[PDB]
Amino acid sequence: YTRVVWCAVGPEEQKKCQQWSQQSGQNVTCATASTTDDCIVLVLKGEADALNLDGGYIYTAGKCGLVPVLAENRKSSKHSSLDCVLRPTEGYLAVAVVKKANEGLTWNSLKDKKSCHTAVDRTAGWNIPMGLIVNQTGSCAFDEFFSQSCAPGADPKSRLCALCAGDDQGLDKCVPNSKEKYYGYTGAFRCLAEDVGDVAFVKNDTVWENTNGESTADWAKNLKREDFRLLCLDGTRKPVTEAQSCHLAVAPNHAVVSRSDRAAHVEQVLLHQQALFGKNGKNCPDKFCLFKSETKNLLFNDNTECLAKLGGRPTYEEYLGTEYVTAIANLKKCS
Amino acid sequence: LEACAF
Numbered sequence: 001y002t003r004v005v006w007c008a009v010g011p012e013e014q015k016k017c018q019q020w021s022q023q024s025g026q027n028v029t030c031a032t033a034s035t036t037d038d039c040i041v042l043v044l045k046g047e048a049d050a051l052n053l054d055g056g057y058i059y060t061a062g063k064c065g066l067v068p069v070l071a072e073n074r075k076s077s078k079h080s081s082l083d084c085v086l087r088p089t090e091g092y093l094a095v096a097v098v099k100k101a102n103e104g105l106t107w108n109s110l111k112d113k114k115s116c117h118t119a120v121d122r123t124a125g126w127n128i129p130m131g132l133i134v135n136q137t138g139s140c141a142f143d144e145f146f147s148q149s150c151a152p153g154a155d156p157k158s159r160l161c162a163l164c165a166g167d168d169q170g171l172d173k174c175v176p177n178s179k180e181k182y183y184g185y186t187g188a189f190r191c192l193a194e195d196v197g198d199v200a201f202v203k204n205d206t207v208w209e210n211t212n213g214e215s216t217a218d219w220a221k222n223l224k225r226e227d228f229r230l231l232c233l234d235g236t237r238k239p240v241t242e243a244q245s246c247h248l249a250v251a252p253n254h255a256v257v258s259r260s261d262r263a264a265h266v267e268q269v270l271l272h273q274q275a276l277f278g279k280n281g282k283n284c285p286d287k288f289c290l291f292k293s294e295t296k297n298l299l300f301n302d303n304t305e306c307l308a309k310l311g312g313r314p315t316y317e318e319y320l321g322t323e324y325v326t327a328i329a330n331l332k333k334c335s
Numbered sequence: 336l337e338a339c340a341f
């Protein structure tokens with residue numbers, strides 16, 4: 001066995017990683033970089049072994065030769081006697097979320113509105129909605145579609161970063177890590193909740209998990225699910241209980257990637273680390289919980305029940321699926 | 336649909 005070196009994206013992940021490392025007795029140790037792309041480069045250089053990635057970043061990492069190893073599996077919708085680690089993953093619903101009180105807004109009137117995205121290059125926050133918008137408008141000028149946005153990872157002086165807020169001190173505006181107040185699923189949802197933006201591209205679970213007291217976070221603790229609507233592609237608005245019939249796409253779950261020569265060993269270590277620190281793990285919550293970070297989704301999404309084995313030793317294209325890959329490929333023609 | 340970005 002070797003140690004596995006995890007790559008943490010920004011300082012809040014680095015802190016959680018350091019706590020994991022200490023609890024694992026250094027079976028896992030930590031490298032940290034400022035962005036997911038830079039973590040992918042550390043992994044390609046062999047200076048880190050692995051990290052968990054949204055499907056859009058899996059595409060980046062997979063074009064560079066890194067491979068999926070285990071997928072996040074959240075609470076199953078339907079009944080299953082299968083253990084979490086063996087249950088097939090179900091994909092999450094990419095949605096566009098607006099305030100109920102913003103009554104005129106539908107999918108067909110998004111032009112010149114303000115948008116909140118998890119980050120450039122992520123599935124629900126970017127690849128799915130911008131791919132759809134490029135397609136529908138017949139124009140690659142997706143940087144001119146919304147009047148202002150927060151899209152972490154875009155040029156910080158551009159309209160795509162105009163709404164981003166940076167950290168406590170207002171430094172690091174638009175950096176694609178958790179120090180940016182509007183980064184990621186919860187940041188893009190907060191960007192809508194605070195009416196900085198008119199629309200947030202997140203996933204269905206984000207809305208549930210940050211409303212009706214499911215989050216105690218100060219910006220979220222008082223949000224009511226009834227105050228939000230989903231935007232459907234047919235131009236209708238639905239309550240957030242209707243995401244199965246009003247989503248933009250089904251996304252492949254976030255998954256751990258590594259170099260191919262390290263995957264088997266990364267997989268074995270992770271299966272053992274989640275037996276200790278995962279949901280009902282032997283030492284969670286007593287000592288450390290790998291899948292909690294007070295809603296901040298650090299290293300893994302907080303709704304993860306386990307990391308699951310993949311069927312078919314899939315390549316990254318197999319894992320993402322041919323349609324998603326082609327959608328990304330098409331959108332990347334614009335850049 | 337081609338090479339590694341890095």
Ligand SMILES: *[C@@H]1O[C@H](CO)[C@@H](O[C@@H]2O[C@H](CO)[C@@H](O)[C@H](O)[C@H]2NC(C)=O)[C@H](O)[C@H]1NC(C)=O
Nearest residue numbers: 075076077093204205206208209214242243244
């Ligand atoms: C949208 O996401 C929410 C949050 O994950 C899902 O609601 C959860 O569903 C699980 C599985 O049934 C329940 O056991 C949880 O208690 C629910 N959480 C909350 C906070 O209510 C919901 O099913 C998803 N909707 C769709 C269409 O997939």
Ligand SMILES: *[C@@H]1O[C@H](CO)[C@@H](O[C@@H]2O[C@H](CO)[C@@H](O)[C@H](O)[C@H]2NC(C)=O)[C@H](O)[C@H]1NC(C)=O
Nearest residue numbers: 127128130131132135322323324326327328330
């Ligand atoms: C945007 O449109 C492109 C161009 O049509 C879509 O790409 C096609 O997707 C279908 C369905 O998977 C494939 O069978 C075609 O072969 C693809 N066409 C081309 C020219 O590559 C893409 O899926 C759309 N983007 C979305 C829906 O986000």
Ligand SMILES: Cc1cccc(Nc2ccccc2C(=O)O)c1C
Nearest residue numbers: 090091251252253318319320321322
């Ligand atoms: C065609 C199809 C349909 C549903 C899922 C996929 N691919 C996946 C493969 C692994 C993990 C997740 C997915 C998914 O899209 O949820 C494909 C290729």
Ligand SMILES: *[C@@H]1O[C@H](CO)[C@@H](O)[C@H](O)[C@H]1NC(C)=O
Nearest residue numbers: 001023024025026027273276
């Ligand atoms: C660390 O890994 C070693 C080797 O597999 C193992 O004996 C030990 O149980 C692990 N400990 C923790 C705390 O993860």
Ligand SMILES: [Fe+3]
Nearest residue numbers: 054055123124
């Ligand atoms: Fe995602």
Ligand SMILES: [Zn+2]
Nearest residue numbers: 247248249250
């Ligand atoms: Zn669908």
Ligand SMILES: [Zn+2]
Nearest residue numbers: 312314315318
């Ligand atoms: Zn295969």
